[PDB]
Amino acid sequence: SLVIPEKFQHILRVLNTNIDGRRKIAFAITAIKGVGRRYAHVVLRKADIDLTKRAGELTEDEVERVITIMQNPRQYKIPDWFLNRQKDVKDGKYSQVLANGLDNKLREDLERLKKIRAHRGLRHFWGLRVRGQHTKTTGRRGRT
Amino acid sequence: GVTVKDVNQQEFVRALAAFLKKSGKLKVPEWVDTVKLAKHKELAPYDENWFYTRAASTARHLYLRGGAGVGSMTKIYGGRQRNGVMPSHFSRGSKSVARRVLQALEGLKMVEKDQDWGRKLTPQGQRDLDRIAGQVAAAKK
Amino acid sequence: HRIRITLTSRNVKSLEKVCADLIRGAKEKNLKVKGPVRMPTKTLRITTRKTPCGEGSKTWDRFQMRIHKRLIDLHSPSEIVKQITSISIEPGVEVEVTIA
Amino acid sequence: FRKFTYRGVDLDQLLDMSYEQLMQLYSARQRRRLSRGLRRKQHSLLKRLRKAKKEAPPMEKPEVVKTHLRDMIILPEMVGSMVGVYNGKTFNQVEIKPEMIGHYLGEFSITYKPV
Amino acid sequence: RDKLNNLVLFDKATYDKLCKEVPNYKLITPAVVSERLKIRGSLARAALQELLSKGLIKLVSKHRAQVIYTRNTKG
Amino acid sequence: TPDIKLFGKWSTDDVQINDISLQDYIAVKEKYAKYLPHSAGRYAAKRFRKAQCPIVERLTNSMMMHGRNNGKKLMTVRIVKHAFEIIHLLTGENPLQVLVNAIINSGPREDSTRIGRAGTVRRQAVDVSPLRRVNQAIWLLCTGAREAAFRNIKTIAECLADELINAAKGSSNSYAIKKKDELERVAKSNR
Amino acid sequence: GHQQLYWSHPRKFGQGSRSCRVCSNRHGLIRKYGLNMCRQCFRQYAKDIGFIKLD
RNA sequence: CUGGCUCAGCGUGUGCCUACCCUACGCCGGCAGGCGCGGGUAACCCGUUGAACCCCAUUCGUGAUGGGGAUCGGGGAUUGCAAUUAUUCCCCAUGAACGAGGAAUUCCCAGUAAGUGCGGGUCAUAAGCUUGCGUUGAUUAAGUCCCUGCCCUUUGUACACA
């Protein structure tokens, strides 16, 4: 039971993510940009997985079923409030975004505010703090 | 014989939460496997059957100090909201969790919507509380 | 018959003068009297800066105002102790009488 | 390059609108903003803005409407228009493309300078 | 500089080292065994609970911070 | 027990301080032998009242430092209890005698200080009093446990148990004995 | 309209709503126990109000 | 980190003009709130102020890591006439320098330092501030003029706006 079983996966590759097999599953699947601690814990509670295992002890069938629940939010009764992307201003679909998708969403969004030339975009472009934060004595490491 | 106050309360609540789970018919809500217990807490409870523990916790809290409504349950189930970079502050519990636990114990013959507000512990409740107290003390014997 | 007189004052020994006066009154007029119940004192506390301007060393005043309260209960009709309560009114002490 | 869409609803659908649906469509700050009541007290100003907009000429780029107001949420009924937003100093002559919906009219100005 | 690459799960020869070396240690704690065998404290504790339950190590007194064991008495 | 008072589970009787200099300023036997370190206080009021405070209570008091561990005498006493279990197991004989011996062997007896002819200055070596021997011995073994435990799996109760076993034997391994011999070196360097 | 413009900006709160009951300026007021006094006017008049320095 | 267990003291509370109070209890909601009917101008009601630290047990295992929470996207609530230059609050997301800090330098000796939370002021919205209150509770010292200041006595002076 406690011995490293046959075919224990030291390295996993899923959604272009390096998940280490030695990590505990709830903090293992948390590695990718879009999946945090809370979203990792709710979806591993959804998939009928014992969260007491390491991320290498599971089987590829248990990997795909936790990957499907991940990309299928409302399809397994995860409510509107939990999602990291709710009512997109182009799509209008309430569903979570993951690594490369969210990189596209954020980049398009701040470049959209830049191109409509709303101040948020103008503060983004001129390279200052966006949320009315005092810059008279803060933000010097990033700006020499 | 012995009563509820004559045994270690650390073993009592686990015994009573198990006792309620041996019944296993506690009108448990839908969103149990997605919810965070307070907006001062960060993660969902480590354990999966946190509802039966809290039901038994509320139950013995009404036993010891009765006439307690949902607002005193949010007070008693409070902790630090460590505000990140700003200093920590006392914060309350989730009103929904406390209310639904009492409504579960109301539907079951243990508590009663009490005059002067809040919930009492009814004679069947007190009986089941006092008998398991004897079972836990006789077990620790 | 349960008349209640609440004596309230900023001065203690002026309050105790009026309090010790009304008990002497109730006893010499042959009346059942609950002795003066010393309710807790309230400390009206205001702490100011001392300077009108800004550029003095940081010093604070600490103004206090203590307010004291006794209440004496009586089992008697209204008009007897009305004649007593009308006697010995000081400038300092403040009296409020309720009937039931 | 493809004709854009608002939340998940075509601009023609948003332009054929009764207020309490668009109240539901856009974000919560704009929801309470318009749920807060009528516009014949302080926003007699914004019914002047409405009157100024719906008094447009024949098919040309309509006359710039100057405003001493910044806090205006751009609904679909005032889009494709020209406006002078008062910055204290400058009346910012800005044009309203239909990506201004649920944004403040006053969020289209800069006062200062970088070094 | 240095990095401490402890195991997450048991090797067959490390399990041999545990079950044979640990019942002669006069002080057995999750800290001591993790240092000597190179294992994570979670597995180190899990093995100590497995070994006590199977009936080899002698527990002294545990705590939420510190769980202390020792060797079984021979004579 | 109107007989004799164990320290949780440790025997106070037949524990002798062999050194005569740290006999007067070490309070463990017969009268100062109590169940707990955690008592009221009222040693800090006067000068030499510190001397009579149970040496195990002195160890507890000194063990907690660096802000985060301030006014946590309940956490500190539970670490000392757990360490006392571990020094009993690792060694075999009485944990009180382990602590006493470690404190006697960790105490310096000559150390340097800047002296008069105040015209300029001079670094001359002087003797430390039996109370200062206790004070520096307990401080140096407490910072020995702290500095050893900081970022290493070896838990603090086990770290103290190492430092106490080492110093009690007169190791040269213990942080307390290294620092002592460093002070007595600098004393020899300027005497 | 002058009765539309003149004193038209609403003041039901802020330090614009309240003034020192003596000197009528809006900086460093005492509102405890319905004083409504600037700290300088209060600290001047304190011992007629019945406040003492004891502590 | 998640559970469970168990202990306070100071206060303030419906406004003069003043609009604006503290809130139990119950149903809806994940949360912020929302909708109901009450108490209190007060040792009367919030309230026995079920506070934090701490204490008992799980998870983690020396990894910039379940340490850190800056910066950032989106959505959700509340106050106000109005929050764009994000007021405040909530949720998912994002996971930065930081491995205990050079020259130098501040405060302090007993319920004191420090940790830890709680009220008052500001206040429509409202604490990283200040001003008070408990809670847990030490190391070192009973000395000196070495450094820094200040005050004396003797002394010299052609200075007295010194």
Side-chain angles (χ1 to χ4, degrees), chain A, chain B residues 1-116 118-141, chain C, chain D, chain E, chain F residues 1-116 118-119 122-191, chain G:
Chain A
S1 189
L2 273 79
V3 71
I4 187 161
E6 288 174 21
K7 287 196 71 189
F8 181 95
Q9 316 290 329
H10 267 250
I11 299 161
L12 306 175
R13 285 301 303 254
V14 163
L15 276 176
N16 314 331
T17 314
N18 272 103
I19 299 166
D20 204 321
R22 307 170 302 173
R23 294 211 88 91
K24 201 143 285 264
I25 323 167
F27 293 92
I29 71 156
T30 310
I32 197 55
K33 188 147 188 150
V35 184
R37 308 163 92 155
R38 198 87 173 78
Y39 178 67
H41 275 90
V42 69
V43 300
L44 265 164
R45 186 60 60 185
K46 276 287 170 182
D48 302 333
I49 288 169
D50 53 334
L51 275 79
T52 54
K53 270 194 163 199
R54 290 317 194 286
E57 301 196 31
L58 85 163
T59 305
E60 278 281 304
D61 189 26
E62 314 314 318
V63 172
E64 283 109 45
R65 80 179 296 156
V66 70
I67 289 160
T68 46
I69 174 61
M70 167 170 292
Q71 289 124 27
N72 303 334
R74 295 219 232 169
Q75 283 74 249
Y76 284 121
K77 204 169 284 163
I78 291 170
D80 200 70
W81 54 269
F82 201 98
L83 311 163
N84 84 331
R85 179 80 246 190
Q86 300 175 21
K87 202 200 284 195
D88 186 25
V89 196
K90 315 186 186 299
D91 306 342
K93 169 58 191 205
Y94 310 83
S95 270
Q96 189 98 5
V97 196
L98 270 298
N100 193 24
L102 195 145
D103 295 330
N104 303 155
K105 286 293 101 177
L106 181 139
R107 177 262 313 165
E108 279 178 57
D109 204 333
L110 75 85
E111 290 298 325
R112 195 193 66 77
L113 282 115
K114 169 54 177 61
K115 275 216 62 52
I116 67 186
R117 295 273 279 175
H119 164 275
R120 288 182 82 213
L122 307 193
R123 195 88 79 77
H124 266 293
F125 184 59
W126 300 348
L128 325 162
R129 294 294 162 91
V130 180
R131 298 186 189 182
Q133 310 171 351
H134 298 194
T135 67
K136 180 165 184 179
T137 187
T138 68
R140 288 151 183 266
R141 64 193 276 265
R143 295 279 168 264
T144 183
Chain B
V2 292
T3 75
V4 178
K5 282 191 171 187
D6 205 65
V7 75
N8 190 25
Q9 295 287 330
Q10 288 284 115
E11 277 188 52
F12 184 82
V13 176
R14 284 186 166 175
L16 188 63
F19 175 78
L20 285 189
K21 191 62 202 175
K22 298 308 177 182
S23 195
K25 50 170 84 83
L26 255 78
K27 303 296 172 218
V28 193
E30 179 264 305
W31 36 240
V32 188
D33 69 303
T34 197
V35 79
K36 177 175 73 171
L37 257 60
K39 63 102 176 177
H40 81 260
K41 291 319 191 196
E42 296 188 329
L43 277 63
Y46 175 88
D47 203 347
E48 61 178 315
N49 63 354
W50 55 262
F51 203 97
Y52 294 82
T53 299
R54 191 150 295 243
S57 305
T58 293
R60 73 160 271 285
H61 277 307
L62 298 197
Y63 172 90
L64 289 185
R65 180 171 171 179
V70 66
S72 55
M73 306 320 298
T74 51
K75 200 177 288 154
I76 194 168
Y77 298 124
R80 290 171 54 191
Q81 194 205 354
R82 45 169 291 165
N83 265 25
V85 76
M86 282 175 290
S88 317
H89 286 281
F90 169 84
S91 174
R92 308 189 144 282
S94 294
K95 284 201 202 90
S96 292
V97 178
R99 189 168 71 265
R100 287 220 174 275
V101 153
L102 286 178
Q103 287 195 35
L105 286 184
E106 278 185 326
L108 186 53
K109 290 78 185 163
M110 309 293 278
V111 310
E112 163 167 7
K113 170 65 201 86
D114 185 20
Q115 66 194 344
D116 282 314
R119 276 79 180 197
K120 194 164 288 192
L121 210 79
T122 64
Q124 168 163 9
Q126 188 186 16
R127 162 175 58 161
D128 297 333
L129 263 293
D130 271 302
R131 290 193 98 177
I132 193 167
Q135 292 163 26
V136 174
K140 195 176 165 181
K141 192 267 285 187
Chain C
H1 273 155
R2 270 63 183 184
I3 304 175
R4 191 164 79 185
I5 300 94
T6 79
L7 306 186
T8 298
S9 192
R10 210 184 324 123
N11 189 288
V12 167
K13 74 168 69 77
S14 186
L15 183 73
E16 290 308 272
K17 176 50 170 283
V18 174
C19 165
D21 166 71
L22 291 206
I23 183 56
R24 274 183 66 77
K27 299 291 268 187
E28 74 191 353
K29 294 316 196 81
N30 304 47
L31 299 179
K32 271 152 274 194
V33 52
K34 288 276 180 179
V37 191
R38 279 68 161 241
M39 300 272 97
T41 70
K42 288 167 171 173
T43 71
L44 281 73
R45 220 178 303 189
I46 301 166
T47 79
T48 326
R49 273 289 289 282
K50 212 176 289 192
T51 182
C53 78
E55 299 300 337
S57 194
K58 277 65 154 176
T59 52
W60 302 71
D61 275 326
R62 312 184 216 145
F63 290 89
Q64 311 197 321
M65 172 172 172
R66 292 167 146 75
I67 181 69
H68 308 273
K69 171 177 292 185
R70 281 89 178 118
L71 65 95
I72 314 192
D73 319 330
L74 279 159
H75 306 164
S76 188
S78 302
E79 307 93 331
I80 312 104
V81 176
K82 266 184 53 52
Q83 310 316 314
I84 280 181
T85 308
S86 66
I87 284 290
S88 177
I89 43 158
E90 272 61 18
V93 190
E94 187 264 348
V95 191
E96 286 198 339
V97 188
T98 187
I99 311 97
Chain D
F1 44 84
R2 70 275 193 184
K3 56 170 159 281
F4 90 94
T5 292
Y6 197 59
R7 286 284 165 166
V9 189
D10 193 5
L11 194 68
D12 285 336
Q13 192 82 20
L14 271 79
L15 194 44
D16 295 326
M17 170 270 279
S18 184
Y19 269 156
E20 280 64 36
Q21 263 77 46
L22 194 78
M23 279 184 161
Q24 300 154 31
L25 296 192
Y26 56 47
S27 53
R29 173 52 63 190
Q30 289 91 249
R31 295 197 35 260
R32 89 166 299 124
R33 169 54 187 269
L34 274 182
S35 297
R36 267 293 281 225
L38 82 164
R39 282 95 189 80
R40 279 312 320 171
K41 193 203 289 185
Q42 74 291 75
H43 296 328
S44 295
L45 197 160
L46 293 182
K47 298 311 302 178
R48 175 82 199 100
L49 186 148
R50 193 275 187 186
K51 280 186 68 54
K53 255 48 165 201
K54 296 314 303 289
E55 289 180 343
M59 188 184 171
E60 279 88 20
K61 304 172 85 171
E63 57 199 325
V64 288
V65 178
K66 298 188 302 186
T67 182
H68 269 225
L69 170 146
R70 308 195 59 79
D71 57 334
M72 188 47 189
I73 72 175
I74 285 163
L75 313 165
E77 210 206 332
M78 304 165 288
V79 182
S81 302
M82 290 281 289
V83 292
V85 176
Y86 199 23
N87 194 26
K89 174 174 191 175
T90 297
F91 279 111
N92 301 308
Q93 185 169 316
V94 302
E95 56 179 330
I96 309 307
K97 58 170 55 172
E99 297 88 330
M100 306 278 213
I101 302 171
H103 279 210
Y104 286 96
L105 187 77
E107 201 185 345
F108 297 103
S109 186
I110 303 287
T111 75
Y112 40 97
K113 195 75 78 79
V115 66
Chain E
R1 208 187 183 272
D2 204 330
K3 183 176 297 304
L4 210 65
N5 278 114
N6 297 296
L7 304 185
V8 67
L9 283 171
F10 277 121
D11 183 40
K12 65 157 290 297
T14 62
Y15 178 66
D16 296 347
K17 189 178 172 198
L18 182 135
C19 289
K20 295 311 306 174
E21 182 54 36
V22 305
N24 291 345
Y25 277 131
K26 276 207 302 175
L27 183 73
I28 326 167
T29 68
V32 168
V33 301
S34 56
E35 183 268 308
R36 294 282 256 161
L37 306 205
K38 297 285 281 278
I39 51 176
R40 292 194 173 189
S42 58
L43 179 140
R45 273 199 292 93
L48 275 178
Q49 289 159 29
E50 194 182 1
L51 260 70
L52 187 84
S53 299
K54 200 180 159 194
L56 276 173
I57 73 183
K58 181 176 72 70
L59 172 142
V60 179
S61 184
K62 80 179 169 168
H63 190 263
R64 68 215 168 92
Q66 195 59 36
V67 184
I68 303 165
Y69 308 87
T70 177
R71 62 194 211 157
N72 183 273
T73 60
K74 307 185 280 162
Chain F
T1 170
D3 313 318
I4 292 297
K5 302 91 195 169
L6 269 75
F7 180 80
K9 69 181 75 177
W10 313 117
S11 301
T12 187
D13 306 341
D14 310 312
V15 182
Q16 183 176 175
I17 297 102
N18 197 20
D19 191 4
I20 208 164
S21 56
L22 282 318
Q23 179 166 335
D24 301 324
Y25 302 80
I26 282 180
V28 78
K29 175 144 203 170
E30 175 54 40
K31 302 173 295 306
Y32 319 102
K34 311 207 160 191
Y35 296 88
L36 267 294
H38 189 298
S39 184
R42 298 292 285 239
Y43 313 101
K46 263 174 65 202
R47 193 187 185 189
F48 279 110
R49 287 189 175 178
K50 186 187 287 166
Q52 294 195 340
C53 169
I55 69 175
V56 62
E57 180 169 18
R58 305 275 301 283
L59 170 57
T60 294
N61 283 315
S62 296
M63 262 301 308
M64 53 165 186
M65 267 189 57
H66 284 81
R68 63 186 194 176
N69 313 319
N70 286 176
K72 278 166 177 162
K73 205 182 178 185
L74 299 172
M75 178 170 72
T76 316
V77 62
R78 81 145 159 77
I79 295 174
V80 159
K81 175 173 196 202
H82 288 328
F84 267 34
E85 289 182 32
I86 294 175
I87 62 171
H88 171 70
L89 296 186
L90 269 188
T91 330
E93 79 280 7
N94 206 41
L96 300 191
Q97 194 76 67
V98 177
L99 178 54
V100 160
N101 293 351
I103 281 171
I104 293 167
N105 296 145
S106 169
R109 53 179 73 78
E110 182 150 27
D111 188 24
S112 57
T113 181
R114 209 166 303 265
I115 207 156
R122 193 51 39 182
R123 199 177 306 123
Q124 290 196 16
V126 294
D127 309 306
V128 303
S129 327
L131 180 50
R132 186 55 185 252
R133 300 201 68 203
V134 165
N135 289 11
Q136 209 163 29
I138 295 172
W139 185 82
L140 280 165
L141 68 83
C142 287
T143 181
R146 174 171 313 100
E147 197 272 319
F150 186 71
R151 274 153 62 78
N152 205 343
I153 291 176
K154 182 168 294 315
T155 49
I156 187 60
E158 214 285 322
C159 292
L160 179 65
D162 300 315
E163 286 290 311
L164 276 186
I165 284 167
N166 292 323
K169 213 201 301 175
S171 63
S172 193
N173 200 339
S174 199
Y175 171 84
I177 314 300
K178 154 163 42 176
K179 285 293 174 182
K180 179 199 163 178
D181 293 358
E182 180 161 29
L183 306 199
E184 296 194 343
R185 153 165 63 238
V186 178
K188 182 168 182 174
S189 308
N190 52 47
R191 75 178 161 72
Chain G
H2 197 212
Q3 314 317 127
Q4 162 64 238
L5 192 140
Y6 180 48
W7 191 238
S8 68
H9 197 252
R11 285 155 187 189
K12 298 174 190 286
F13 52 71
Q15 66 226 58
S17 178
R18 60 187 57 84
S19 55
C20 179
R21 68 187 293 160
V22 193
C23 40
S24 77
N25 59 328
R26 317 168 169 281
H27 293 86
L29 301 197
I30 321 295
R31 291 159 63 168
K32 276 175 64 66
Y33 319 119
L35 274 165
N36 303 320
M37 295 255 266
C38 68
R39 59 196 189 83
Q40 291 87 351
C41 286
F42 165 58
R43 189 217 164 282
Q44 175 182 3
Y45 275 116
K47 86 155 171 63
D48 289 343
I49 298 175
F51 283 83
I52 319 292
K53 267 179 286 176
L54 297 175
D55 199 346

